[PDB]
């Protein structure tokens, strides 16, 4: 699984398309991490979201 | 291009006051983090504040809290710093940039203007 | 009170690979980015996320980050690569926005 550090680098990569829907899985193989706004939390601007309260992640398996 | 144009700096004495602002041209202001940074005379850039696209979180370098005052105004594309009781060793170009990110966990400075210079001398 | 420790000074003939040193604690759990002031001019992001160019740097700039040592390198350097090279990093809330003391590199041209 990726580290915090990784995370919020995918979250830094894809802030422009980043939606209440779930993201792309962060890699092509192995282990990744999927993210989205909160959707309760749609309302603040993208700059300003809180890593714990108003982003989800969570783990993609991919093959190896 | 991404233009940040700074200006208002100047020289001014020890517990005298200056109000710097920046105008943003390129990009949809009211989105970005938006920051100043300064660098004294032969020493290293040090990082002044940064504050966010509504104005609701902004952050100061523990040195600078109380006497320094950033604001913004997204009709206006434009960024302040407001100094007060300024100090010798406040003395030192200022530079406006603007961040992508997030304010409050994962940020980052990519473009920067070319600086004004304050100078505060007794 | 997180420390980011650069060497004051690097020189390097054209051509060659300057090479950038910036320790920190733990600095491989960071992400480090670096700035680039040459002289007079406005600060320019060379490398953010350790490694990452951002659209317009030539490819010859590289970041790497592990343990405590991050480093920017330079392949086949050129004159204008002359400038003041700052890593930067998140240390915390309170802390937001950390600069390393600046390496000034030299191109003996």
């Known amino acids: 699984e990726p580290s915090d550090k990784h995370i919020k680098e995918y979250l830094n990569k894809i802030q422009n398309s980043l939606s209440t829907e779930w993201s792309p899985c962060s890699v092509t193989c192995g282990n990744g991490i999927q993210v989205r706004i909160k959707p309760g939390s749609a309302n603040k601007p993208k700059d300003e979201l809180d890593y714990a309260n108003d982003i989800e992640k969570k783990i993609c398996k991919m093959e190896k | 291009e991404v233009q940040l144009v700074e200006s208002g700096g100047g020289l001014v004495k020890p517990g005298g006051s200056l109000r710097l602002s920046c105008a943003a041209s390129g990009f949809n202001f009211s989105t970005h983090i938006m920051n100043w940074v300064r660098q004294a005379p032969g020493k290293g850039l040090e990082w002044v504040s940064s504050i966010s696209s509504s104005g609701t979180y902004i952050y100061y370098a523990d040195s600078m809290k109380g006497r320094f005052t950033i604001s913004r105004d997204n009709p206006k594309n434009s960024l302040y710093l407001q100094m007060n009781s300024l100090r010798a060793e406040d003395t030192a170009v200022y530079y406006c940039?603007?961040?992508?990110?997030?304010?409050?966990?994962?940020?980052?400075?990519?473009?920067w203007g070319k600086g004004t210079t304050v100078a505060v001398s007794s | 009170s997180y420390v980011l420790t650069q060497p004051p000074s690097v020189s390097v003939a054209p051509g060659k690979t300057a090479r950038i040193t910036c320790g920190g604690n733990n600095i491989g759990s960071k992400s480090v980015h670096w700035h680039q002031q040459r002289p007079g001019q406005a600060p320019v992001l060379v490398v953010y996320?350790?490694?990452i160019r951002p659209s317009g740097i030539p490819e010859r700039f590289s970041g790497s980050n592990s343990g405590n040592t991050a480093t920017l390198i330079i392949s086949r350097v050129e004159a204008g690569d002359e400038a003041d090279y700052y890593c930067?990093?998140?240390?915390?809330?309170?802390?937001?926005?950390?600069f390393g003391g600046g390496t000034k590199l030299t191109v003996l041209g």
């Open positions: 996320d350790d490694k």
């Open positions: 930067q990093v998140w240390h915390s809330s309170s802390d937001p926005v950390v």
């Open positions: 940039a603007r961040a992508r990110g997030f304010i409050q966990f994962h940020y980052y400075m990519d473009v």
